């Protein structure tokens, strides 16, 4: 936990040099080694998302690890503010998504997972499945369902 919190903390003072499109600050950023820096974070990141989705003992961890998943992306679209069309710093972060290509899917992957929560929660197909409503349904009926 107090390794993440550095990594967003210096992950916000990125921003911070960016943000108000200064546009040399973001020339000499995208020229440096900090899409090999995401590239990696993002490969953390899908695995990681996983295995600590399986108790709730590391479930206190993973929103702090959510919570830097947020953090980095308000990072590059600070970079994308001051683009063209086929901008220049468009270009290279598609980039870092073509050469970290089979990492970005397992996280498009599971956030596909608990967006149909609601409403599949929100069905009343599923409402009175097992039961009426109390806080409580199955295993079993919920498997089928």
């Known amino acids: 936990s107090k390794a993440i919190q550095v ?3 210096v992950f916000n003072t990125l ?3 960016i943000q108000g499109p200064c546009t040399g600050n973001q020339q000499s950023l995208a020229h ?15 695995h990681m998302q996983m295995k600590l989705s ?9 929103k702090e690890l959510m919570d830097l998943q947020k953090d980095m992306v308000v990072m590059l679209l600070s970079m994308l503010e001051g683009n063209v069309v086929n901008g220049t710093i468009g270009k290279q972060m598609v980039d870092m998504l ?17 967006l149909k929560l609601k409403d599949l929660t929100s069905s009343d197909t599923f409402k009175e499945y097992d039961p009426d ?6 295993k079993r009926d919920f498997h089928k369902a």
């Open 133 to 138: 409503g109390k806080g409580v349904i199955s």
């Open 32 to 46: 440096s080694r900090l899409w090999d820096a995401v590239v990696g974070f993002l490969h953390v990141f899908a």
């Open 98 to 114: 073509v050469e970290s290509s089979n990492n970005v899917e397992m996280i498009l992957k599971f956030f596909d997972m608990f």
């Open 7 to 9: 990594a967003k903390q």
């Open 15 to 17: 921003t911070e040099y």
């Open 54 to 62: 399986q108790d709730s003992s590391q479930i206190e961890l993973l």
